[PDB]
């Protein structure tokens, strides 16, 4: 990792992150065979089997009722991202719901537990059968429940049953609680055997396959499930796994803290509002403004392209000489000098103005330094902690190359506009000069 302190604006840009960006969805359609359960009835009295059976049949009968429905940039982007995801998933479920497609899916899963299927709407879904409960119900439990008597002396039957239905009951809980669209792929929607098997079937390059098989917790975390329905005594649902059609491109993260100067004792503060993740995608700079969008694993940042807003390629001029590019770098400005620490990956920005006493120290030595007034950049090599008054921040002990891009801060070199002095999320030349 690399990190430039941009002295001109009290903001770091951290570079050398690689990219993984979701660009499509892969559909795995699971036929969980609940089995013959609605032909078994305990009728003798209270019993272990009756209780598990009633739960299983009650859950199944419940599930039949469950169904799905068949500028401040952050709020915009994360609005679109979720709307796009559900619409992409629902559009496929709405093909699979057709009885011609379910019966095709079910039929190709007759003698194999895994099938590749092409829907009439052309999507080449994978299909999977889960039968562990059906096999138990058909071979064991149907033979045990003689003539509706079921308080049998075999407790191994009843304890066994409470294991096999456990997955089914968990699937019902998750779809019913979420009204048919789960936010993430639980171990009960897709076990880790099936995720690895589904990943290995994706129509993707082996680089993505290896990367996905390593980061499979992220693949699980980005995907989501939709309930198709209950058909016969199979619940049918589907899991939209991500396809990471962009990888290995540059990304960087911009952090900022308030830059201020006491012009005649009045703090002309400025803060960059264009903070957050940026990536190059296919020859376009893409900005991911919402904090849910992107997550790191080492150098890899896992973003969603549906959350990205394209920004002009000139926008990196805001990281080189924001003072003097004509691109409209977004800032806030105003009178009040907030003093704060912004923890970057390889260090901390420390905004420290009149009032608070800021210091940096190491566990070996205590206070190493009292920081000057004004924004300072503390590499994670300079100290182990920063303090702001009595508040102590532990710094991220991480190897990387820090840099300083020197320059007199804008706040200290341009004059603030007399009125309005406080302006939120404006192009910089509206605050200064």
């Amino acid at each position, epitope marked *: 990792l690399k990190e430039s302190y941009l002295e001109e604006s009290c903001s770091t840009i951290t570079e050398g992150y690689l990219s993984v960006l979701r660009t499509g969805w892969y559909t795995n359609v699971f036929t969980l065979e609940v089995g013959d359960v609605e*032909n078994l*009835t305990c*009728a*003798d009295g209270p019993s272990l089997i009756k209780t598990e059976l009633d739960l299983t049949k*009650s859950a199944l009968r419940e599930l039949r009722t469950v169904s799905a429905d068949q500028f401040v940039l952050g709020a915009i982007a994360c609005g679109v991202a979720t709307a796009a995801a559900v619409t992409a998933g629902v559009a496929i479920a709405k093909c699979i719901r057709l009885e011609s497609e379910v019966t095709a899916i079910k039929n190709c899963l007759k003698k194999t537990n895994e099938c590749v299927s092409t829907l009439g709407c052309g999507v080449r879904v994978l299909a999977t059968a889960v039968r562990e409960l059906k096999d138990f119900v058909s071979k064991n439990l149907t033979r045990a429940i003689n*003539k*509706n008597k079921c308080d049998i002396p075999d407790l191994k039957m009843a304890v066994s049953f409470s294991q096999f239905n456990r997955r089914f009951l968990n699937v019902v809980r998750q779809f019913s609680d979420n009204a048919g669209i789960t936010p993430a792929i639980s171990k009960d929607l897709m076990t880790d055997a099936e995720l690895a098997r589904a990943i290995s079937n994706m129509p993707t390059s082996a680089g993505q396959i290896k990367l996905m098989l390593e980061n499979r917790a992220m693949v699980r975390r980005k995907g989501f499930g939709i309930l198709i329905g209950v058909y016969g005594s199979s619940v049918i649902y589907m899991v939209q796994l991500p396809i990471f059609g962009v990888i290995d491109t540059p990304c960087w993260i911009v952090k900022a803290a308030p830059s201020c100067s006491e012009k005649k004792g009045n703090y002309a503060c400025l803060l960059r509002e264009d903070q957050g993740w940026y990536c190059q995608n296919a020859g376009s700079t893409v900005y991911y403004p919402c904090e849910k969008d992107c997550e790191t694993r080492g150098d890899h940042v896992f973003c969603d392209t549906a959350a990205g807003i394209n920004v002009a390629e000139q926008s990196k001029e805001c990281n080189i000489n924001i003072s003097t590019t004509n691109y409209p770098c977004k800032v806030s400005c105003g009178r009040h000098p907030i003093s704060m620490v912004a923890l970057s990956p390889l260090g901390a920005l420390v905004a420290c103005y009149k009032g608070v006493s800021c210091s940096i120290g190491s566990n070996r030595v205590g206070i190493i330094k009292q920081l000057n007034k004004g924004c300072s950049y503390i590499t994670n090599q300079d100290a182990d902690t920063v303090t702001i008054d009595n508040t102590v921040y532990q710094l991220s002990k991480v190897e990387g190359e820090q840099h300083v891009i020197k320059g007199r801060p804008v706040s200290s070199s341009f004059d603030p506009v007399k009125f309005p002095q406080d302006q939120f999320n404006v192009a910089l030349d509206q605050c200064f000069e």
Partner: antibody
Amino acid sequence: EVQLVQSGAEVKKPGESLRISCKSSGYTFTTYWITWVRQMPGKGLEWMGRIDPSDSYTDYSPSFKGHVTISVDKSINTAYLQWGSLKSSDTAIFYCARQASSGKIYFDYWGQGTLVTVSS
Amino acid sequence: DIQMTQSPSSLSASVGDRVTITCQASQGINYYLNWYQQKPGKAPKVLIYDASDLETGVPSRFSGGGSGTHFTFTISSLQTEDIGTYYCQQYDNLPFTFGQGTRLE
């Protein structure tokens, strides 16, 4: 069409023997349980018991266990209900009814009821 | 035994009326409740099974619902042939007690 025609209407002195009959037809007789249901005149229905003709296993209501018996002539698709001693209280209409499933225990096809009357 | 209280013991209604009948077990019977119509001088006829499901060829004006202990049955618009006595029946455990039977006239 599944149809369960019954014996008819029968008159007895108390303590006489009697058997009702139900010639089921239109389905494979062994695969469904035959229930017997009693209705005292204008009163509620009372489930008396059932037989599985596949093996003549029987359940009874505790009220009737050991008073009535349920049987089948599997050879002629015919169930029976039989009393040792008819009490004069035991005058009612009796319907045999096919139990619709081994899991979903409703009674789907009902015989035309047999009147039994028992007095002296 | 599950006792099957059923109310009201009788009804009267116009054609078109959304009459409703209730059955209430003495225990939990899950959803194992059936409803029968008996026309006068006829053997009973099943209308609903499993608390909620229309038997085949039953007119879709009939309906029911509920679970656990309280169940209801509704004729969403009564018709002149629907005059008769209605019985609930649990099958959650042996013996399969019928309800008291509610006469609709």
